[PDB]
Amino acid sequence: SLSTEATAKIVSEFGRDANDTGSTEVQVALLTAQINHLQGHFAEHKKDHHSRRGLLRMVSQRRKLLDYLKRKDVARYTQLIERLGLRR
Amino acid sequence: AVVKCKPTSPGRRHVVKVVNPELHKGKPFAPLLEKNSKSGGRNNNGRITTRHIGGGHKQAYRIVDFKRNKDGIPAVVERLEYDPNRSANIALVLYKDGERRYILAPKGLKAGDQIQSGVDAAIKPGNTLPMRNIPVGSTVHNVEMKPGKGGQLARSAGTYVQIVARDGAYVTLRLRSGEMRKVEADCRATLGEVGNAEHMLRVLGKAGAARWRGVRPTVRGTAMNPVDHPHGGGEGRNFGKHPVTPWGVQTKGKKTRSNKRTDKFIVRRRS
Amino acid sequence: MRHYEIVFMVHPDQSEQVPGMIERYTAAITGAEGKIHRLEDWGRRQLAYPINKLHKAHYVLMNVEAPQEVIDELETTFRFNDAVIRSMVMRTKHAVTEAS
Amino acid sequence: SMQDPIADMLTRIRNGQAANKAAVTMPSSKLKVAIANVLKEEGFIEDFKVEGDTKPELELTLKYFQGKAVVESIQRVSRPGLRIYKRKDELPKVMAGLGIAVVSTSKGVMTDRAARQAGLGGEIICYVA
Amino acid sequence: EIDYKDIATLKNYITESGKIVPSRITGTRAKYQRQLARAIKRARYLSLLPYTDRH
RNA sequence: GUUUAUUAAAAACACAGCACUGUGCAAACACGAAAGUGGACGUAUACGGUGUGACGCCUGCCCGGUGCCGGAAGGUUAAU
RNA sequence: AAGCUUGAGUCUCGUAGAGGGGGGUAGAAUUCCAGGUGUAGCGGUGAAAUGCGUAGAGAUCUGGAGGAAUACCGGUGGCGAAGGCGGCCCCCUGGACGAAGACUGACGCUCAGGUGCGAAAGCGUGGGGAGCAAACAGGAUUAGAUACCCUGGUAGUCCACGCCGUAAACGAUGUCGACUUGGAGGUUGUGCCCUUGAGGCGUGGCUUCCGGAGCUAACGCGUUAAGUCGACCGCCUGGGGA
């Protein structure tokens, strides 16, 4: 549950020539935008294992797509994880 | 919150105290402070009046208001501090022209909100109005049940009063004692609950922890000398006769209410 | 902005107070940049069976086209007033303009 | 899910022949069209045809002559997890010489005959009669 | 699903015994009895219909 | 930690915590032949009475007798 | 390493659902509370009896308190990871699914030990107590009754939460993919014919019963296969003892 109007602030910055939205650099950003939204969501409230598993599904796909991007090009990986919060 | 001590030395592991990271501190407001003096059960007219009292470290009394007489003036909460006289903690209030008062703490542990009183006042904590205003089934806080005694009931940590029913000029209130009472609907109430509510969770852990509060050790009537209590020293582990007061009279299960003047206001009695 | 009809059950013997409540409820819609479509009465009507000893209610409805974020701070304003009672907000389903 | 393009190749043929079907169709691959070319040369099938712009699909025709199925054994032997490799005199005599085997080799897909004639061995891919 | 706030219509589908008229009797499809039960529940929680019967 | 000065020092006593009982507050309760004060400028997360003994795991039956409560319809019944 | 996509993924306009969480929000009787009207009955079993009742019961009314669950529709049905979950009304939200297209470019399948879930019952701190009821005390019944059956009844059931982690957790069938006779039926999208559309011709998702080739000792599984075949994981070699 993320609008076409909220994606319009992600595909604008993480794109390059349009349409780029199928690419790993943009899908890792669209997953991060859903993860960081469904992180809170929680607090207030906790007791919902369904949306908690949804969050962990989106994280599971992001972990893999990050590892995959790093396995294609390390420079395109490092130039993404300065624009999205990772490893503090 | 409540927190438990580490085993640094013997028995200390049992110690549990109430702690609040937002609770303020400072100096008491002198025009609402008195030293109040120790009473010690030792008697101005003769022999002792009370038992299990001796010593205890210096304390003073902070004067709290239950009259709420300054109507139609907004007042602001300035700070909430630890109180030595009631477990609810007590807040400092500043009125719009310069007057400062101590009040029973509303819930939220916070300062900076402004409060009023009248016949109609805002739904927020610390604002006061008559119980005839509200649809019942809620918490009323400290209640002016008798005008000539101020705001009564629910003064200790986490204490509450439920308003159950209404008709015409009257309403009914139910208490955590087991008693239920009837009052005029025009009686003033502040609505909501008292804060803290953790005071009953405290564990002293140490045999000196009530000594610094003046609490003297309890010696058994069946252990002290036979003339000094009606039970009397053993005759080891054989209590003998029915339990009595130090004054020689039976007490267990025997009801002692003799008031007769307020029973017509009590609609359900404490068991 | 999101549709809500907001229909009140005003007390059948206390409707003499109601303009002061209305002027405080409309304020919460105008402040929020909403759009009032009717703010009109159906008048005094009968109920289906007697509740809280009453068998009548006085009906008034707003149609507000309001921001969705206001609902949980609006449905509480006619919940403890005891002269404007038993309100239904009736979400979505558009709005009729200016009619009874 | 799907790991081996050959693990759904010969089942179609063994099950379609049991259903008495004259043609059997599969998704196409380099090894599938390499096996089909040798199975036509050795006469185990009549013909094969391959077509598709979206996905290329391969259809081969089964022999029944006048009613009775002409291929009397259709087996795989070897799998990618546990492969079978035979040396120049360890090459098999399928159905005690009534059938044949197919091998991949360094010279490309051929019969156990063509491999033994080439004085070489290799990896097994099919067993037939 | 439609016109469920009209009680002059709804009272043709509920009994003096304080119950519901069967879909066998109205000649209606099974999901009309669901539409009717939803109309009854949506009239109850709107002060249009009573929740219970008896004198 | 407490335990009697110069033969009776600890397992006895207290203590953290456990239960029952009286108390709606001008409390109940106590001392005061009282004036008054203590209870407490505490208010049921608060006080009076009696036993248990930190901590972890724990609590069968009996209301005839002697006390106490609920009922006051019936009995017994005094000064009057 | 270089190159791809028709493996896998996300999406424009859109679809149903007792899924979850937070809020609420509504009604009934055994009960309790203060009484009327009123006379010897009430209660209960296969039989009876303790017991409730003349202190005015049972029942019938007036005015009121208390606790739990959500009647109807409800099924041929949905959802959820399982366990489980039906109200209306207002938010917060996971996953799945259709139409007509597109952007990436093997990013897939599985998984020791982990990392997180709970039905009933149980443990903790504070509340709660209509109905049902372990335990218990009676009525009995009987050779005996410590039990069935009848009269009463605490724990437990509910809530703030915190713990517990187990089940006949069961269509007793590990997860994942392809290929392939059906019928009858339910449920939800949807392509098309002026839908001039009630009608007709199609087509994806989910799924119930009957059953065929195959499998199986047998019963069953049966295109949602226990079939046909492959990847990985978890297990295992007789009861009595244990």
| Cβ-proximal residues to D39 (8 Å cutoff; 6+ apart), any chain | D45, D60, D128
Task: Yes or no: say if D14 and D76 are a contact pair by the CB < 8 Å rule.
Answer: no
User: For chain C, what is the radius of gyration of the CA atoms?
Assistant: 13
The Cα D2–Cα D84 span in angstroms is 21
The helix/strand/coil state of D115 is helix
The Cα D61–Cα D76 span in angstroms is 19
Q: Of B144, B113, B109, give the one whose Cα is nearest residue B128.
A: B144
Disruptive mutation site among C44, C49, C61 for chain E (greatest number of E CBs within 10 Å):
C49
The Cα E14–Cα B139 span in angstroms is 42
Nearest-Cα distance to chain C for B123, in Å, is 9
What's the CA B245/C1' G228 distance, rounded, in angstroms? 93
Asked if strand F contacts B45 at the CB level, meaning under 7 A, the answer is yes
| Phi, psi torsion values for B262, nearest 5 degrees | -115, -5
User: Which positions in chain C touch E47 (Cβ < 8 Å)?
Assistant: 9, 47-48, 51, 57, 86
Q: Residue B203 pairs with which residues in a beta bridge?
A: B16
Q: After which residues is chain B broken (C to N over 2.5 A)?
A: none
Which tokens in the block code for residue B192? 């909501």
A38: alpha, beta or left? (left if phi > 0; alpha if psi -120 to 50): alpha
Which tokens in the block code for residue C17? 């107070």
CATH number of the D74-128 domain = 3.30.1490.10
Q: How many CB atoms lie within 10 A of CB E36?
A: 20
Task: Yes or no: say if C97 and C14 are a contact pair by the CB < 8 Å rule.
Answer: no
The Cα B61–Cα B180 span in angstroms is 31
User: For chain B, what is the radius of gyration of the CA atoms?
Assistant: 23
What's the CA D77/C1' G200 distance, rounded, in angstroms? 54
In chain C, which residue's Cα lies nearest the Cα of E55?
C49
The helix/strand/coil state of B238 is coil
Type of residue numbered B33: L
Task: Domain ranges for chain A, please list them.
Answer: 1-88
Nearest-Cα distance to chain C for E31, in Å, is 23
Question: Which H helix or E strand runs over E32?
Answer: helix E30-44
Task: Yes or no: say if B18 and B2 are a contact pair by the CB < 8 Å rule.
Answer: yes
The helix/strand/coil state of B74 is coil
Dihedral sign computed on CA atoms, order D33, D38, D44, D47: positive
| Phi, psi torsion values for D56, nearest 5 degrees | -75, 125
Which tokens in the block code for residue B150? 């101020």
Task: Domain ranges for chain D, please list them.
Answer: 5-69, 74-128
The helix/strand/coil state of B76 is strand
User: Which positions in chain E touch C42 (Cβ < 8 Å)?
Assistant: none
The verdict on a CB contact (< 8 Å) between C88 and E48 is no
Which DSSP state fits E3?
A: S
Q: How many CB atoms lie within 10 A of CB A85?
A: 9
Strand F proximal residues, B:124-163, Cβ < 7 Å:
146, 149, 152-159
Task: Yes or no: say if C38 and C99 are a contact pair by the CB < 8 Å rule.
Answer: yes
Q: Residue C51 pairs with which residues in a beta bridge?
A: C54
CB pairs under 8 A between C and E: 14
| Phi, psi torsion values for D93, nearest 5 degrees | -115, 85
Which tokens in the block code for residue A85? 């919060």
Q: At CB < 8 Å, which residues of chain C contact B? A: 80, 82
Cα distances (Å, whole numbers) of residue E12 to A84, D26, E30, E52: 64, 64, 17, 17
Token pair 């070319």: residue: D37
What are the b/e assignments for B86-111, b being 16+ CB within 10 Å?
bbbbbbbbbeeeeeebbbbbbbbbeb
User: Which positions in chain C touch E7 (Cβ < 8 Å)?
Assistant: 48
CA dihedral B52, B54, B55, B59 (to 10 degrees): 70
What resolution (Å)?
12.0
The Cα C23–Cα C40 span in angstroms is 13
| Cβ-proximal residues to A11 (8 Å cutoff; 6+ apart), any chain | A18, A20, A21, A26, A30
Type of residue numbered B134: I
Token pair 């006061």: residue: B128
Type of residue numbered B164: V
| Cβ-proximal residues to B48 (8 Å cutoff; 6+ apart), any chain | B41, B42
The Cα C71–Cα E28 span in angstroms is 39
What are the b/e assignments for B197-211, b being 16+ CB within 10 Å?
bbeeeeeebeeeeee
The Cα B268–Cα B178 span in angstroms is 8
Nearest-Cα distance to chain C for B95, in Å, is 27
D5-69 adopts what CATH topology?
Ribosomal Protein S8; Chain: A, domain 1 (3.30.1370)
